[PDB]
Amino acid sequence: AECSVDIQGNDQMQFNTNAITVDKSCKQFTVNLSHPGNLPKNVMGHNWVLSTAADMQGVVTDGMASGLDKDYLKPDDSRVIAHTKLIGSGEKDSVTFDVSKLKEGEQYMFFCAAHAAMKGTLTLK
């Protein structure tokens, strides 16, 4: 099985996929985020954030209120399973999480905290 994925966020404010699969055998899963654009992070920086679909809007609301100083996430928000740092063009970051953290029967999503329009699903198979 494969227990990691490579994902890109670019200068046009989009990720290069809207769907990640996590094999049910994985105990840990790694997301390798890169930014193959030319814009730096103070213009078009991206991160990658994981929550349930049901929690996404609340995470974004509280992140918005927390602001740029906190990379648009409430610090220590228990609804956020994992997240990367904010990266600009040519930079990269990876995050690894325990697959045991996914609540059984719940659909998960990923998104960019800076650009909540950038989103997708993360699913067990």
Binding footprint of Cu ion on the chain (CB under 5 A):
46, 112, 114-115, 118
Residue placing its CB nearer to Cu ion in the complex, 12 or 78: 12
Q: In what order do the strands lie in the sheet with 108-111?
A: 19-22, 119-124, 108-111, 49-52, 82-83
Residue 121 beta carbon to Cu ion: minimum distance, rounded to whole angstroms: 17
Residue placing its CB nearer to Cu ion in the complex, 14 or 30: 14
Residue 42 beta carbon to Cu ion: minimum distance, rounded to whole angstroms: 13
Q: Is 64 annotated as a binding residue?
A: no
Residue closest to Cu ion when measured from CB atoms:
112
Q: Are 10 and 16 in contact (CB under 8 A)?
A: yes
Residue placing its CB nearer to Cu ion in the complex, 60 or 118: 118
Residue 3 beta carbon to Cu ion: minimum distance, rounded to whole angstroms: 25
Q: Are 18 and 112 in contact (CB under 8 A)?
A: no
Q: Is 46 annotated as a binding residue?
A: yes
Per DSSP bridges, beta strands 119-124 and 4-8 are unpaired
Q: What is the DSSP string of 70-110?
A: GTTS-TT-TT--EEPPPB-TT-EEEEEEEGGGSPTT--EEE
Q: Is 118 annotated as a binding residue?
A: yes
Helix, strand, coil in percent for the chain, rounding step 5: 20, 35, 45
Residue 44 beta carbon to Cu ion: minimum distance, rounded to whole angstroms: 7
Binding site feature residues: 46, 112, 115, 118
Binding site feature residues for Cu cation: 46, 112, 115, 118
